[PDB]
């Protein structure tokens, strides 16, 4: 944590989650529980949406976030975005619920298994997992393994799109997609030269090639981080503390949330119109909005509207939380703000 | 005997029960005996009204109120508010009388035979008023029992016979509710409805689905709240914002009961759904509108409406004060903007035309069950408000210490700076 100066700080229950920042086993338990919550949301919401699905109503008119996402990636969608068979959605949600139960069981296991600290546990092999908030070598290996998992996921997406096929609004029906590979076109999407704009990708072939590239990059980076200790300059720049790593991750997540929010409202290929609804338009009054570009009269809002706005707010407040945690981890205590209207300088490290 | 005199307690005979404040066992006996009294009255009155029941006359003409409560729940009734057999009423009355016998036995046993102060016998049953945790837990247990009761009523309405729904087609009919309402928006719209004529606070419920869903919701909440009370302590601010003594708890209960009594009066006087007009007779609004419609029927047979302040079609005369009244026999002759004249020209089915006159005669010589219940419980509610004030003031003063008079030599008013 931070504990400006004085150690052994006392936290109220409102900020009570900072108590286990030093208990590696409990840290593991909390995060396994959180991942359980995420996958439980996926499965349970899939079923909750299936319960009230109307084939007559267009998919985006009714309030869904999961049926469009499943129908996009194959999974029982006919020609012209028609939900022919509604059983694969049930299967997907059920697998998600089973996974959630597994994760939650692991969470309780670790919360009650042994000592709070993973150094003391006499497993003699769980001690291989005890980490520190100062050592960058172990955290580099951890980063490498997690990048390996992400790259393996991108690879799985590439394979599933190659074999099972995937929906293509330009084609108009589920279709296998050849994995492209053109580093030149990847970099041209990087520059956003006039032909290629990253948020206006038109061919699923380009998307598939980019995903292949991402998988390769993530796997290579994972290997590299597992093998190689961080360089000294990365110790010079970054502080070594838990809240600092939370700040870095929060900044990254806020950026990714904003990117995904903009992606939803604009791209029509990777977010097909028949499932999510017509494209939005970005407005800026006091705060950014996404206008539905459609008469909300007797149609509510398209699912794309909800996804885009929710993730704009998620990204913005992840940025604000990143600022808060980076300010703390660098050394700034906000209590000094109370000295604003006095003659004492409102400033410290 | 000792402690049963004025000298040893300080209370005159006319305040004798006050002596029971700190005698746990006898106080419990008194409560149990009083509960026995209540259920004995219920059973005895049920048996009386059954013994004097007459199948041809309506309940409200016949003059029965405990029977109408059972009739609403559908015990031995049929479509159109017709009894089939008065046996289940006898069953209920007999069960209540037996329960009263058992409760009276328990009350006598704790009053005289059993321990006088449970604190001596045990500690779960030994309680002192100023133990905040113990009182919290007891309140929680009884809350759980209430929640079970509410869920029981919902379960009866959904699986066991149901309730007499007077919005079933062709007059009322006993129904089993299958689609309870559970949308929270509906619940908030009910709570935050204006208590004034601008709707009705909770008295304005008109379908039985909402009733059953509401009882489901409240039973769940009561069970949860009871568990919460058992499992937690009173917060610091809670400990500092109340008075902790027996009389204070009594005063709180009195206030709650006064509020409930007023609301019950409102229900029995303005509601025709959970108090079917087939049994309790027509409400005042229903009676006035039935009179207006019957006169209109006669005048249309031999060869009067108007515009609402909002411009709809309503009846004319005094009855305009009931322009928004909704009824089962009148609802089919509705329209987007008030009851259409064309509809009244040829849409009056025979049973509605019979109900109109049958209600016109029995306008609340003849006193409706609604009149009895409303008057009795308004008077009871007012007196319970008075009792709430009396006991709350006494509790506050006694906790402060100046209950038995002002102190001659340390009088507080004598120390304040004169305002002039």
């Amino acid at each position: 944590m931070q504990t400006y100066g004085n150690q052994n700080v006392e936290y109220g229950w409102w900020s009570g989650n900072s108590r286990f920042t030093d208990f590696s086993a409990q840290f593991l338990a909390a995060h396994i529980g959180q991942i359980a919550s995420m996958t439980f949301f996926a499965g349970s919401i899939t079923l909750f949406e299936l319960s009230r699905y109307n084939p007559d109503i267009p998919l985006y008119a009714q309030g869904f976030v999961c049926l469009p996402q499943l129908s996009r990636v194959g999974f029982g969608v006919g020609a012209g975005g028609a939900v022919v068979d509604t059983y694969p959605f049930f299967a997907v949600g059920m697998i998600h619920l089973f996974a959630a139960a597994v994760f939650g069981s692991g969470a309780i296991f670790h919360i009650l298994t042994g000592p709070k600290v993973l150094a003391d546990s006499d497993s003699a092999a769980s001690q291989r997992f005890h980490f520190e908030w100062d050592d960058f070598e172990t955290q580099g290996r951890i980063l490498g393994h997690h990048l390996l998992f992400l790259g393996s996921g991108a690879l799985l997406f590439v394979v599933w799109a190659a074999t099972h096929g995937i929906y293509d609004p330009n084609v108009g029906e589920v279709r296998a997609v050849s994995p492209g590979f053109d580093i030149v076109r990847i970099f041209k999407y990087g520059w956003a030269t006039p032909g290629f704009n990253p948020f206006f990708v038109d061919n699923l072939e380009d998307v598939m090639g980019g995903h292949l590239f991402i998988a390769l990059i993530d796997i290579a980076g994972g290997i590299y981080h597992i093998l190689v200790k961080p360089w000294p300059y990365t110790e010079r720049i970054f502080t070594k503390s838990g809240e600092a790593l939370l700040g870095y991750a929060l900044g990254g997540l806020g950026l990714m949330g904003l990117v995904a929010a903009y992606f939803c409202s604009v791209n029509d290929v990777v977010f097909p119109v028949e499932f999510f609804g017509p494209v939005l338009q970005p407005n800026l009054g006091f705060l950014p909005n996404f206008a539905d570009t459609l008469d909300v009269s007797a149609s509510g809002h398209t699912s794309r509207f909800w996804i885009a706005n929710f993730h704009y707010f998620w990204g913005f407040y992840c940025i604000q939380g990143h600022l808060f945690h980076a300010l703390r981890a660098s050394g700034f205590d906000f209590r000094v703000l109370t000295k604003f209207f006095t003659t004492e300088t409102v400033e410290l490290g | 005997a000792a402690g049963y005199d004025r000298a040893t307690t300080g209370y005159g005979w006319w305040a004798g029960n006050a002596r029971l404040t700190d005698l746990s066992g006898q106080l419990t006996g008194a409560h149990i005996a009083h509960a026995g009294m209540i259920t004995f009255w219920a059973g005895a009155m049920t048996l009386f009204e059954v013994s004097h029941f007459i199948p041809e006359k309506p309940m409200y003409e016949q003059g029965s109120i405990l029977l109408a409560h059972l009739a609403a729940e559908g015990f031995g009734v049929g479509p159109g508010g017709e009894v089939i057999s008065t046996y289940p009423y006898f069953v209920i009355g007999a069960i209540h009388l037996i329960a009263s016998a058992v409760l009276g036995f328990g009350g006598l046993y704790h009053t005289f035979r059993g321990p006088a102060k449970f604190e001596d016998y045990s500690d779960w049953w030994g309680y002192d008023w100023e133990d905040k945790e113990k009182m919290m837990q007891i309140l929680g247990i009884h809350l759980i029992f209430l929640g079970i009761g509410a869920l029981a009523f919902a379960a009866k309405a959904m699986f066991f016979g149901g309730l007499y729904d007077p919005w079933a087609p062709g007059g009322g009919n006993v129904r089993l509710i299958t689609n309870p309402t559970w949308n929270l928006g509906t619940f908030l719209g009910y709570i935050t409805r204006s208590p004034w004529g601008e709707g009705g606070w909770i008295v304005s419920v008109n379908n039985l689905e909402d009733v059953v869903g509401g009882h489901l919701l409240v039973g769940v909440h009561y069970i949860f709240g009871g568990v919460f009370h058992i499992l937690v302590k009173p917060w610091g601010w809670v400990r500092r914002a109340y008075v902790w003594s027996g009389e204070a708890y009594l005063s709180y209960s009195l206030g709650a009961l006064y509020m409930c009594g007023m609301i019950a009066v409102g229900y029995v006087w303005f509601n025709n759904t959970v108090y079917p007009s087939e049994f309790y007779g027509p409400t005042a609004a229903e009676a006035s509108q039935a009179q207006a419609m019957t006169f209109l029927i006669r005048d249309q047979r031999l060869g009067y409406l108007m515009r609402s302040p909002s411009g709809e079609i309503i009846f004319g005369g005094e009855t305009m004060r009931f322009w928004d009244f909704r009824g089962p026999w009148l609802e089919p002759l509705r329209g987007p903007n008030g009851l259409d004249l064309n509809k009244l020209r040829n849409d009056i089915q025979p049973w509605q035309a019979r109900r109109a006159a049958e209600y016109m005669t029995h306008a609340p010589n003849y006193v409706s069950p609604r009149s009895w219940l409303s008057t009795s419980h308004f008077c009871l509610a007012f007196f319970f408000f008075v009792g709430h004030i009396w006991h709350s003031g006494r509790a506050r003063a006694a906790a402060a210490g100046f209950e038995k008079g002002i102190e001659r030599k340390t009088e507080y008013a004598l120390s304040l700076p004169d305002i002039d």
């Binding site: 109220g12 229950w13 009570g16 349970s44 079923l47 909750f48 299936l50 319960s51 049930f90 309780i108 009650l112 298994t113 | 959904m158 699986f159 149901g162 129904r175 089993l176 299958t178 559970w182 499992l231 937690v232 302590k233 917060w235 610091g236």
Partner: protein, 329 residues
């Protein structure tokens, strides 16, 4: 020491072991007792003319599926078989009550033959007990298989009872010609039941024969205990209940539409449930709906109880919970 409301926790003591055994015997008697009693009342209230999925008959349809008074389908011709089965179960109940009372107060207070006597931390003892129970379970499965071979159960596609290939290794993969929850072949049911009986008997032989191994003693961190064993059993029960509820909701070959009513639709509000998809009268539900929903929610609360007992089995005490909420006021 335990209070009266938690009185059965007293049986946890190895000081009074045999009495503990008595309780279990009694339970089974009660169970089989109900199997009689319920049926009798059902046989009283069962009209033959009406469809069998309207009135509160749960066991009668189960017997109807197992032949027992069905001809060309939708045929009830003898209610005496149901009464016979109920009477058999209820009479067995008296024997089981007798054994329960023999161990409760006549038999030894503690088993400490001694071959039956065991301890909560004797993995060989539990291994052989487990083997024997598995052998009996597989024996019952094979008995059902024999019943299929000889008597034969009702089939809807054939419209009548009939008697009777291991592609089970593909059903387990849920390949699109599979998802066993949609079985529609009597031969599939019979073959799978043969397989499960064989595997159960093999496992029972193995467990009697071989003691628990260290590799699997690693993972069983705390189950060698009363609370742990109870928790694992409860979790298994909940799993089975979920599977049975889904089978009842979806499958029609085993549960014919004649006696159970049409299939159920899985719906979800705040919590899951199963809707009729049948135009039954308002306030009435098919027997299939009752079975699926009650089974499922019993299994759900079995899962909750499994969590409770498992947590108590590991290092956790629930009575500490208010105290925690006391400190962080």
């Amino acid at each position: 020491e335990y209070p009266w409301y938690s009185g059965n926790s007293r049986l946890e003591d190895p000081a009074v072991q045999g009495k503990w055994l008595a309780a279990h015997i009694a339970q089974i008697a009660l169970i089989v007792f109900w199997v009689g009693l319920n049926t009798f009342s059902e046989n009283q209230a069962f009209d033959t003319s009406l469809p069998m999925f309207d009135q509160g008959l749960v066991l009668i349809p189960h017997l109807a599926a197992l032949g027992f008074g069905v001809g060309s389908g939708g045929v009830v011709t003898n209610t005496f078989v149901f009464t016979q089965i109920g009477a058999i179960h209820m009479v067995s109940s008296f024997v089981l009550f007798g054994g329960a009372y023999f161990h409760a107060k006549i038999g030894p207070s503690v088993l400490a033959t001694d071959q039956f006597a065991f301890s909560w931390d004797d993995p060989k003892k539990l291994g052989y007990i487990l083997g024997h129970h598995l052998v009996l379970i597989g024996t019952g499965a094979l008995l059902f298989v024999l019943w299929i071979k000889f008597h034969g159960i009702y089939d809807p596609t054939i419209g009548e009872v009939r008697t009777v290939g291991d592609v089970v290794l593909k059903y387990g993969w849920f390949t699109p010609g599979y998802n066993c929850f949609f079985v529609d072949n009597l031969e599939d049911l019979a073959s799978g039941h043969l397989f499960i009986g064989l595997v159960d008997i093999a496992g029972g032989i193995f467990h009697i024969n071989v003691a628990p191994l260290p590799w699997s003693k690693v993972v069983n961190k705390y189950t060698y205990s009363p609370d742990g064993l109870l928790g694992t059993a409860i979790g298994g029960l909940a799993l089975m209940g979920f599977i049975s509820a889904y089978f009842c909701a979806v499958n029609t070959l085993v549960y014919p539409v004649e006696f159970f009513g049409p299939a159920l639709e899985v719906k979800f509000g705040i919590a899951p449930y199963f809707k009729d998809t049948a135009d039954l009268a308002d306030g009435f539900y098919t027997s299939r709906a009752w079975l699926a929903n009650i089974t499922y929610y019993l299994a759900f609360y079995m899962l909750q109880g499994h969590l409770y007992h498992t947590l108590k089995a590991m290092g956790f005490k629930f009575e500490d919970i208010p105290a925690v909420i006391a400190r962080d006021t």
